[PDB]
Amino acid sequence: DIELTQSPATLSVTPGNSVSISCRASQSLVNEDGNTYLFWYQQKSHESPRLLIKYASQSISGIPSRFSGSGSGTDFTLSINSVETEDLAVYFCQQITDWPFTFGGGTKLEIKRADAAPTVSIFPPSSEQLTSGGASVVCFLNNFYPKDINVKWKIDGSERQNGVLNSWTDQDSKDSTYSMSSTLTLTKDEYERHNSYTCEATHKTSTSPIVKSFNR
């Protein structure tokens, strides 16, 4: 089958700047009838792919002039000449010259934004959950930038590492920020042995950490 290798796997950009995504095919994509079947797609979070370019460079109607395709044979490029914040998504190349039709593995485009500190919130285990016998303490770290960040849970000042589950949101198309959620899950019995529950966030936006805390 014809294999498509995209490069790079991920890249970042500042609105107004341009970006360049490549697609390498294992063999020429020029059909016996001299037509090249290289298609380019844009896929946003929670959506199906959306076709942008057909036949390597032929523009679809309704796609901004921003997007352009070039290349031939085995080497193709998708270029966006003046990136808008809406443009964040995963981009794929596809060939329909040979059977079976194949896709490249995708290229993740991310945006650059001004730095931003996270809004932190801690929540005690709900009564319903404690009734069942477990105790999850949750802390939301919303709307920050850059994505790199550290969270530490502390029980009565004592640092806790085991029992934590973390989850990162995808970058926001509207404001280019990131969000994260951290949960420390304990048995009802273990939670009742301490009083102070603390969530601390360390991020570029500060030398000192943001501390959210509650006591039983």
Binding site: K54, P100, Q129, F140, S167
Partner: protein, 214 residues
Amino acid sequence: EVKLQESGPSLVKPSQTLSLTCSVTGDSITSDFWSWIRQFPGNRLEYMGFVQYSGETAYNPSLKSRISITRDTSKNQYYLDLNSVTTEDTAVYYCANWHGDYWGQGTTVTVSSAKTTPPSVYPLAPGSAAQTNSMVTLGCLVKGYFPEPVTVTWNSGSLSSGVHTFPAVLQSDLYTLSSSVTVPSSTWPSETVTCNVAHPASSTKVDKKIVPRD
């Protein structure tokens, strides 16, 4: 214009057959060729095959005689049947015209021998002490369910601008996700705020009111 829509089961056990339906509205299916494309966890896409207006088909060799694509032209819908599935057949299934000009919304399908587990929906209200703040953040913890997916809305989608729904994580073979909403402190508890949670696999549809901790 041309609008696509997938439908089918959320969970199917190994060795069984998976069957989906693509329902088309707008034009007639005799005006084009139609396909099935799936996306695995990792986001890799595999073109499954297509069916022409004459009933003729092309199937990807990777699906070693386990696939069948047929149609119901009067009903304006086409189908997919995949044999003796295994874990590897877990993915989200999309239907699209053969060139990818139009696509449906996609449908999540998990193949497993594990039993369906409905989520425990717990509310997240701030600890009983507080209030110097102009905004207030609440949340819902959707715990220990299987398989994926579940969807969350706050107040039936009336509250959307300050929402964050986080991707589920796996813990002891079960999924757990959370969602947060931020509103002006003058709206809650003054007015109610409820998170609506749906878990398709177990046919779960629960509304949980966020109550202040007294």
